[PDB]
Design a binder for these strands. Structure first.
Ligand SMILES: [Cl-]
Ligand code: NA
Ligand code: NA
Lengths: 117, 68, 58, 93, 92
DNA sequence: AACCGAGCCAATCAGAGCGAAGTGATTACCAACCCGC
DNA sequence: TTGCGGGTTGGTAATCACTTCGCTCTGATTGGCTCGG
């Protein structure tokens, strides 16, 4: 249920991720959400979905969920990847740093076609 | 006007025809699922009888090596 | 071992089918990205009044 | 990682606002009551049919599980009796 | 349908990455383009699992509940139980 | 020593949003007819 | 032949939603230089 948080993550790297998800959950339970203000534009999320010609009609909700879900996705991966860079003494987040983080958890096994071994 | 009022009918007619189609479908889905399983239950009863006879033969043989 | 996540595996293969089919319909020959998209912005990027270090300004 | 028990509220059901007013005739009132019932009774026999399906689906899963266990119990009894017999056989001579 | 419809805007994806990391950090143009491709697949991946399930019940509309189901189905329990709170505050 | 690259920058204009129209879905009403009592 | 109560119909009404096209204002695109790495 919450096993994906520190999956392939140990040391102080496990706490920082759990600390994030907790901050996420707390601000999802707390602050008044403006469902117009979004870091990722709703219109394009719908286009990415409607890029699959199997999908026809989409509820206004799904884009709004994906907008937040993607924000939290990008942020956790970037952080996971950022550890790999600091372990290898780098200030620049490389493609390999991301790749390296995707192999840590079996949750990212859908991206293997985007970034092969 | 008639362009929408009579369309509302065409879209309702569709509703009743879809609901009348699902009630019939799911009624026939019960006949299949209850028959398909009436087969499976009869298949296992065939195995139990054969497995039981197989036990009885092997128990009679081990009985033969002890029955003296 | 090399055994992947079973929950996704079934959907991962389904995507490979849809992902391949689309790439052909898009008429896209190259696998790599383009250097730019919009010519008006590219043309505005040359017209662009710059400084000595290549930074823009007005 | 902890969260509270959050429940998704159902999306607002579509259709025509149910008439707030009471009809001023008992003859059209009992009509309304009996017709309103008809719309629920019909809508219920298709709703209750998913329960009929999922009852069979679950009641048949339990009986299948009993057999698949019962044949494995009777399968191990054969595999037991074979080797046990094999011992008596060898120890006889 | 265009070609770059299958991706989200790179500058938007990049901006979320800048915020995730310290101010003194830098992010490879390759790494940004990788993230863009990733997050864009994350959408299409979850959508397809919600799309087929909807075609079984023979719906046309794909609703947020269908998304939250598809997430738990593809082992995104954490995401599903997080966005469950976002949808509940939305619907009221 | 040799190389590779991300920040830097702020104006263009392709799109993000917004609302309107359209159509579908869904629930509710009713007059009319039937049936049992 | 009265009266009472329930079922059924087709037709209308009402609310929610989903799309498409139009207008507006935004913020994503944009590359050449430096110093780092
Ligand atoms: Cl905080
Ligand atoms: Na935050
Ligand atoms: Na917030």
């Amino acid at each position: 249920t919450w096993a994906n948080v520190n999956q392939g993550l140990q040391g102080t790297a496990r706490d920082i991720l759990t600390t994030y998800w907790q901050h996420v959950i707390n601000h999802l339970e707390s602050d008044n959400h403006d469902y117009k203000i979004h870091q990722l534009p709703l219109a394009r999320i719908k286009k990415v979905m409607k890029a699959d010609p199997e999908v026809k009609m989409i509820s206004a909700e799904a884009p709004i969920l994906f907008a937040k879900g993607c924000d939290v996705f990008i942020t956790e991966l970037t952080m996971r990847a950022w550890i790999h860079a600091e372990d290898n003494k780098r200030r620049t987040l490389q493609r390999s740093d991301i790749a390296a983080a995707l192999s840590k958890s079996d949750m990212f096994d859908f991206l293997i076609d985007i970034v092969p071994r | 006007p008639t362009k929408r009022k009579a369309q509302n009918r065409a879209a309702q007619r569709a509703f009743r025809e879809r609901r009348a189609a699902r009630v019939s479908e799911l009624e026939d889905q019960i006949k299949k699922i209850e028959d398909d399983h009436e087969i499976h239950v009869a298949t296992f009863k065939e195995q139990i009888a054969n497995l039981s006879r197989e036990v009885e033969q092997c128990r009679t043989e081990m009985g033969w090596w002890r029955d003296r | 071992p090399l055994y992947v996540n079973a929950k996704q595996f079934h959907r991962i293969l389904k995507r490979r089918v849809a992902r391949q089919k689309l790439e052909e319909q898009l008429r896209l020959t190259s696998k790599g990205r383009k250097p730019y998209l919009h010519e008006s912005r590219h043309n505005h990027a040359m017209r662009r009044p710059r400084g000595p270090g290549g930074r823009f300004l007005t | 990682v902890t969260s509270k028990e959050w429940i998704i509220p159902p999306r607002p059901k579509p259709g025509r606002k149910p008439a707030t007013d009471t009809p001023p005739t008992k003859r059209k009132a009992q009509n309304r009551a009996a017709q309103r019932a008809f719309r629920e009774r019909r809508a219920a026999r298709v709703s209750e049919l998913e329960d009929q399906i999922k009852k069979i689906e679950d009641d048949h899963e339990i009986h299948v599980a009993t057999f698949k266990e019962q044949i494995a119990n009777l399968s191990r009894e054969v595999e037991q009796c074979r080797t046990e017999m094999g011992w008596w056989r060898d120890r006889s001579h | 349908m265009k070609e770059q419809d299958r991706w989200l805007p790179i500058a938007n994806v990049a901006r979320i990455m800048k915020l995730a990391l310290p101010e003194n950090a830098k992010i490879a143009k390759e790494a940004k383009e990788c993230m863009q491709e990733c997050v864009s697949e994350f959408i299409s991946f979850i959508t397809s699992e919600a799309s087929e399930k909807c075609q079984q019940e023979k719906r046309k509309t794909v609703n947020g509940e269908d998304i939250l189901f598809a997430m738990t189905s593809l082992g995104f329990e954490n995401y599903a139980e997080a966005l469950k709170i976002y949808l509940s505050k939305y619907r009221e």
